[PDB]
Amino acid sequence: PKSMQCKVILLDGSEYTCDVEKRSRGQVLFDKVCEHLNLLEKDYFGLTYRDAENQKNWLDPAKEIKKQVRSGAWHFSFNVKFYPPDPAQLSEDITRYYLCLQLRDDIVSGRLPCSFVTLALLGSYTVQSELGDYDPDECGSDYISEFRFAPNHTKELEDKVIELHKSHRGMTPAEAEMHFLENAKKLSMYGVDLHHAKDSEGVEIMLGVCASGLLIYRDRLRINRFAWPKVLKISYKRNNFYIKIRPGEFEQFESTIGFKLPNHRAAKRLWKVCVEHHTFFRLL
Numbered sequence: 160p161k162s163m164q165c166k167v168i169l170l171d172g173s174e175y176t177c178d179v180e181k182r183s184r185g186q187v188l189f190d191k192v193c194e195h196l197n198l199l200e201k202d203y204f205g206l207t208y209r210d211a212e213n214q215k216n217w218l219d220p221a222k223e224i225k226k227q228v229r230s231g232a233w234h235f236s237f238n239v240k241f242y243p244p245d246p247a248q249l250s251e252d253i254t255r256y257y258l259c260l261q262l263r264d265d266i267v268s269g270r271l272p273c274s275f276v277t278l279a280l281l282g283s284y285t286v287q288s289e290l291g292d293y294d295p296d297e298c299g300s301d302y303i304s305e306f307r308f309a310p311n312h313t314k315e316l317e318d319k320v321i322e323l324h325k326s327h328r329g330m331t332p333a334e335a336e337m338h339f340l341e342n343a344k345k346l347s348m349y350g351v352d353l354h355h356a357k358d359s360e361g362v363e364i365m366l367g368v369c370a371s372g373l374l375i376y377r378d379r380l381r382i383n384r385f386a387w388p389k390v391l392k393i394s395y396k397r398n399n400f401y402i403k404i405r406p407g408e409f410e411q412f413e414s415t416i417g418f419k420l421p422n423h424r425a426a427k428r429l430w431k432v433c434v435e436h437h438t439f440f441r442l443l
């Protein structure tokens with residue numbers, strides 16, 4: 160029975176290494192990672208890998224690892240797949256902790272845009288959870304934390320994190336992570352997976368997939384929302400992606416909306432994440 164070495168980047172940036180049989184389905188590796196992380200609420204999380212295009216793909220837990228990574232290294236990242244709309248309803252604090260770690264990376268990476276004050280408030284709750292009560296002995300008029308908080312760090316932002324941290328005296332880690340999530344969950348791009356596309360007229364847009372539905376970002380003025388209830392069917396063909404959109408109240412026919420993706424693989428990637436999110440929605 161031949162075994163392949165797996166390397167997994169965890170959300171704290173640490174690296175987990177293990178072996179699985181070469182014919183293993185993704186679930187086998189994911190179970191080993193989740194046991195390492197003492198994670199029980201596993202269904203919100205998944206593993207990603209990079210293809211030769213350095214594009215992120217979800218490892219399908221139901222499919223053979225070898226049939227997915229194909230030519231690539233057995234190198235993966237542990238990520239949030241389904242962002243809970245209401246993280247207070249997760250059963251375990253450790254689930255909320257890994258969700259906070261994922262959101263901290265979504266923020267630093269710029270996937271999750273954030274106002275100055277929200278960057279400072281989230282940062283202040285992270286510092287509270289990890290260091291406890293503000294300590295002046297660990298501070299100065301110049302102080303620059305180790306913590307990454309934003310895609311573009313400024314002294315103004317560092318100062319504001321310290322001001323807010325002083326206010327959290329006595330707050331426990333689970334409490335500070337809950338306040339972190341109460342703020343993060345309200346951000347317009349929370350849990351939104353963005354896909355580059357063109358509309359039917361060749362105009363570049365972004366397609367956003369999230370718990371609530373599919374978002375179109377044409378411009379800051381033109382923004383379509385298709386709540387999952389309105390979506391009957393999601394399909395791809397060649398480089399094309401289509402959604403079948405419910406007749407309006409008293410209308411006779413469904414409508415189909417068509418999009419151009421960068422290639423067949425990018426169309427397939429978007430369709431799979433849409434199907435998986437639509438299922439998640441009907442379980443809420």
Ligand SMILES: CCN(CC)c1cccc(O)c1
Pocket residue numbers: 202203241435436438439442
């Ligand atoms: C079990 C997999 N399924 C996929 C959408 C899922 C994922 C997260 C929560 C949940 O209640 C269900």
